[PDB]
Design a protein around this nucleic acid. Structure first.
Ligand SMILES: [Mg+2]
Ligand SMILES: [Mg+2]
Ligand SMILES: [Mg+2]
Ligand SMILES: [Mg+2]
Ligand SMILES: [Mg+2]
Ligand SMILES: [Mg+2]
Ligand SMILES: [Mg+2]
Ligand SMILES: [Mg+2]
Ligand SMILES: [Mg+2]
Ligand SMILES: [Mg+2]
Ligand SMILES: [Mg+2]
Ligand SMILES: [Mg+2]
Ligand SMILES: [Mg+2]
Ligand SMILES: [Mg+2]
Ligand SMILES: [Mg+2]
Ligand SMILES: [Mg+2]
Ligand SMILES: [Mg+2]
Ligand SMILES: [Mg+2]
Ligand SMILES: [Mg+2]
Ligand SMILES: [Mg+2]
Ligand SMILES: [Mg+2]
Ligand SMILES: [Mg+2]
Ligand SMILES: [Mg+2]
Ligand SMILES: [Mg+2]
Ligand SMILES: [Mg+2]
Ligand SMILES: [Mg+2]
Ligand SMILES: [Mg+2]
Ligand SMILES: [Mg+2]
Ligand SMILES: [Mg+2]
Ligand SMILES: [Mg+2]
Ligand SMILES: [Mg+2]
Ligand SMILES: [Mg+2]
Ligand SMILES: [Mg+2]
Ligand SMILES: [Mg+2]
Ligand SMILES: [Mg+2]
Ligand SMILES: [Mg+2]
Lengths: 79, 204, 87, 66
RNA sequence: UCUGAGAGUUUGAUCCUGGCUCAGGAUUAACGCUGGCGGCAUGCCUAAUACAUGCAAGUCGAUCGAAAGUAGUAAUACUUUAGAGGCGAACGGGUGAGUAACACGUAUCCAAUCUACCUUAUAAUGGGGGAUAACUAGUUGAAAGACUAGCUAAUACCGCAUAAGAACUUUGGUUCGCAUGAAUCAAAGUUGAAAGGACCUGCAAGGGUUCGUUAUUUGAUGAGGGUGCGCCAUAUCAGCUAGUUGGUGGGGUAACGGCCUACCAAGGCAAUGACGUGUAGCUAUGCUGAGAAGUAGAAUAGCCACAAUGGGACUGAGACACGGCCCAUACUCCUACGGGAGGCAGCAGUAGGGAAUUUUUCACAAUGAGCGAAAGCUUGAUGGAGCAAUGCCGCGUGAACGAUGAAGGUCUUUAAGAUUGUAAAGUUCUUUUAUUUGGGAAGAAUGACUUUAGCAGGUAAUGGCUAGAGUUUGACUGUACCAUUUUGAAUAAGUGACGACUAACUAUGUGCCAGCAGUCGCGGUAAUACAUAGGUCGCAAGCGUUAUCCGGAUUUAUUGGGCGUAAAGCAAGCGCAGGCGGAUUGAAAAGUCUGGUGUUAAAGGCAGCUGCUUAACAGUUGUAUGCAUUGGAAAC
């Protein structure tokens, strides 16, 4: 009543979830740091992490795009 | 699958197989409806339904046809162009065993049907076993060769008495048929066209 | 990922196929996109009445044929036309 | 088999019903008795068929004399 | 070029209104009697009830370490896979519980979106690092397993160098749009990639083909959203709604959006039917009807929803995932009592419910699907074979001769006679069917692969293309089918009805008793209506009875009815909304008519044709209806 393919897929996606959760938390903390101490330097890090996640497919590329756009809007408004 | 009392049925309907072999007989020359209640009154004034049913039964017993086959053929013919009173007659007469009878190689229609079922008959370019194939004038229906030597072949090859609408080329038993039978060749046993209307009502 | 393939509309002990442009994931004998042409295994000669116009359009669009379909295109010579149009 | 109690006419001459038996009702309507609107099929289940019948026996469930 | 049949029944008798019943089709049918075979098709309508048992999605060693086996003195060669990794498991298969609404059909807008593999085109595929499966050892156990410490490999993972083009912004231009608002630059800033495998040649260096990878580009398919119109019953359901309606900022979603959030307002729907209740998957279509349309949504096909019940989420291009995961509930089962296992509405099959609906099967041989270069592998999808007269179609129980009449039965027109009845007996003949013998396909009139020849790109080699040869592959299958093959009418007929509608009558028995009945109605001691027999009639491997649907029924009347006396004019009036409405001119063109275009999936219906011995059936070509847009007509 069980399939080796299904079991192996579960065992793989556990590790994949761990790694992807780590990356997403890193992105969250970087964007939070940017918003906390707004500075044009942190926007670059936000860009890098969002783009890397969007390529890897962990995050939706359109969400990465909207994050970039809204952070740039905040920066342009403040400067 | 057919009745075994063709004498009784011929005496009831009043019409034999166009030769009166089942009416002349060798006894009593009886031409009355069968059963004890045969010589009674109330002869005419048959209802419309009664006479339609009697005529239909005569038609579909003249060839040994099941009523369901009759409905099938009528549903086939009905859709075409228009008034097919010249087409459905050919349709009804185009039976293979019927064509064998009018060919003259069997004593009786159902005997010809038995021979057809047993496989002593050929076709234009194939062989036929089922005694219901619809034929069209032009097919060379050549008879078998191993059936020409059977102890009962004399009356079969005595086909010189033949209908004009089946052309054999006598002594060659080629037995094709052109010049479709007319109402003259379809005698007064059943010559009516409101059986068509009865099947129009009872069959859409 | 449309795929020119066959589709059965015969009866018991008598198949009859139709070459048709259809998606990969849709079941056999289902919904299709464009019809190419019928086929009878026992048609002796001219077994595949091919279209040669919308079939070429769909392979130009990027349809992936099957083994039997490629064979049918081959005897008539549609594979030559496809390859030379590619070139 | 449902929860409805109906008055049903036994179609035959003589019966083996013993106030407690399993029968198989079909549709029908006897005109004489008001309220009766069903019949009992004879000789299909616990109820015995109608012997001593050679005419129209196929309706009453009687074995062919042979 | 469509195209429609009626009869019985209220009365002493007649005409009309009017209800009931019948003559015709049809089914996922069931039952009684009977029963020989073949070609197609269908076969849990009830308990979305519970399930024993066996199968239903895997594949790749040409991604990677290791291990095992067979050979070999060794170096090594070949085979196999527990594990990591990639792809697929979201397809395919089933069921119709739920759902009265953008669920579905149709037409559209997505300036408000996504899309892996596939198609076209365009740049790169350089260099490092840390780990963990497998394994080793220990603890805990009968085992499932689990925990702890070390050892490894990559196309697993994480950095870095580099952007042809990408994404997000800045500067001003272009062309603008339908209001938000889109489209294109020239320059600039910021951000951003990966992986090699197989083989050939080359002493080497190097070069090359191919598969694959990263970043793009083009389409196409697929998924999602919004809107107009169409789509059940009920007023013996009159108010419903507080994220409900609207505005501002932000968040979230592929996307717009009270989808969410904080603030400010009170609106939104509803007699042209909200809301409530009941019921139901919708559609193409099936059956019926002359038509308008009535009815069921068999099989199959499109779409939706579900997977014991109820929630949540990971991976992923795509799931909130039938045979993946977590939690709760209910139930069943195992235990060595600590703990566990389970979801047949997948294929067969069991119990139960029911009037009732089948093998606990064979093969991947073709078609399709997934992985793979191929070898191939997997495929209860699929193709066959069983069972069942379930329906349509087809063939059989024989043929010729044969008494102005065998026997028996029934009537006797009280000797005679009829009738069954050429029916029978008897003489010859055939073998569809049945039993032996010989031969024996169609599907595989395809094909994948491998040695060859030729062309064909690049060329220094290998792969792709066409022709020939080969392995060539069958569950059905020694099957369909064929032949002068032995025997032989031998192996095969039931069911209903007979007073009228409705084709078809006598006797015996009973005597308002026993019984029949679709309707009128038969039975009270002379019954053609009951029971039996004989005879006859209607069908026939089927025939009757039952249930449901349509017609006939103009009997809800738009086509197509009525309201003085037969059912039906409110007791009458004032009357809002609605319906209808005098004459002439002008404009527009919402109705109306007409031309072009797109679409209305396939199958089904009708017409033609081909193939099964013809048919049923299969295939093939043609064949409408509605919607939208655009262009005209102006009579109403
Ligand atoms: Mg009277
Ligand atoms: Mg069911
Ligand atoms: Mg393995
Ligand atoms: Mg699924
Ligand atoms: Mg199916
Ligand atoms: Mg329901
Ligand atoms: Mg993927
Ligand atoms: Mg390394
Ligand atoms: Mg990697
Ligand atoms: Mg970098
Ligand atoms: Mg009508
Ligand atoms: Mg259906
Ligand atoms: Mg069903
Ligand atoms: Mg269940
Ligand atoms: Mg994901
Ligand atoms: Mg399951
Ligand atoms: Mg699954
Ligand atoms: Mg099952
Ligand atoms: Mg296969
Ligand atoms: Mg049958
Ligand atoms: Mg038949
Ligand atoms: Mg006698
Ligand atoms: Mg005879
Ligand atoms: Mg073959
Ligand atoms: Mg009776
Ligand atoms: Mg009687
Ligand atoms: Mg009506
Ligand atoms: Mg009615
Ligand atoms: Mg009236
Ligand atoms: Mg009145
Ligand atoms: Mg009045
Ligand atoms: Mg009044
Ligand atoms: Mg007034
Ligand atoms: Mg008014
Ligand atoms: Mg269509
Ligand atoms: Mg057809």
């Amino acid at each position: 009543a069980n399939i080796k393919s299904n079991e192996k897929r579960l065992r793989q996606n556990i590790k994949r979830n761990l790694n992807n959760k780590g990356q997403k938390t890193k992105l969250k903390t970087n964007v939070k740091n940017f918003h906390k101490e707004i500075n044009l330097d942190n926007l670059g890090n936000v860009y890098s992490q969002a783009d890397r996640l969007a390529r890897k497919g962990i995050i939706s590329t359109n969400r990465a795009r909207r994050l970039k756009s809204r952070n740039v809007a905040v920066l342009n408004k403040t400067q | 699958k057919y009745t075994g009392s063709i004498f009784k049925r011929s005496r009831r309907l009043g019409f034999s197989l166009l030769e009166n072999n089942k009416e002349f007989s060798k006894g009593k020359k009886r031409k009355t409806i069968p059963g004890q209640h045969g010589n009674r009154f109330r002869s005419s004034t048959m209802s419309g339904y009664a006479q339609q049913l009697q005529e239909k039964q005569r038609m579909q017993y003249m060839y040994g046809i099941t009523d369901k086959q009759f409905r099938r053929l009528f549903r086939l013919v009905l859709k075409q162009r228009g008034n097919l009173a010249v087409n459905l007659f050919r349709v009804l007469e185009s039976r293979l065993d019927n064509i064998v009878y009018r060919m003259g190689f069997a004593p009786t229609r159902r005997s010809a049907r038995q021979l057809v079922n047993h496989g002593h008959v050929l076709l234009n370019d194939r062989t036929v076993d089922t005694p219901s194939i619809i034929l069209n004038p032009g097919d060379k229906v050549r008879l078998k060769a191993k059936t020409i030597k059977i102890p009962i072949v004399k009356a079969a090859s005595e086909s010189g008495v033949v209908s004009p609408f089946v052309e054999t080329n006598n002594k060659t038993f080629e037995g094709t048929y052109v010049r479709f039978p007319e109402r003259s060749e379809l005698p007064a046993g059943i010559n009516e066209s409101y059986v068509v209307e009865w099947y129009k009502r009872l069959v859409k | 990922m449309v795929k020119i393939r066959l589709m059965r509309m015969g009866r018991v002990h008598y198949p009859t196929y139709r070459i048709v442009a259809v998606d990969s994931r849709v079941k056999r004998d289902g919904k299709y996109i464009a019809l190419i042409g019928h086929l009878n295994p026992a048609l002796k000669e001219n077994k595949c009445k091919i279209d040669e116009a919308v079939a070429l359009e769909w392979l130009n669009k990027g349809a992936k044929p099957t083994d039997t379909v490629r064979s049918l295109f081959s005897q008539t010579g549609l594979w030559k036309k496809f390859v030379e149009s590619k070139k | 088999t449902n929860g409805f109690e109906v008055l049903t006419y036994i179609p035959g001459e003589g019966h083996n019903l013993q106030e407690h038996s399993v029968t198989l009702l079909r549709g029908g309507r006897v005109k004489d008795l008001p309220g009766v609107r069903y019949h009992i099929v004879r000789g299909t289940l616990d109820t015995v068929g109608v012997e001593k019948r050679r005419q129209q026996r196929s309706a009453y469930g009687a074995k062919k004399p042979k």
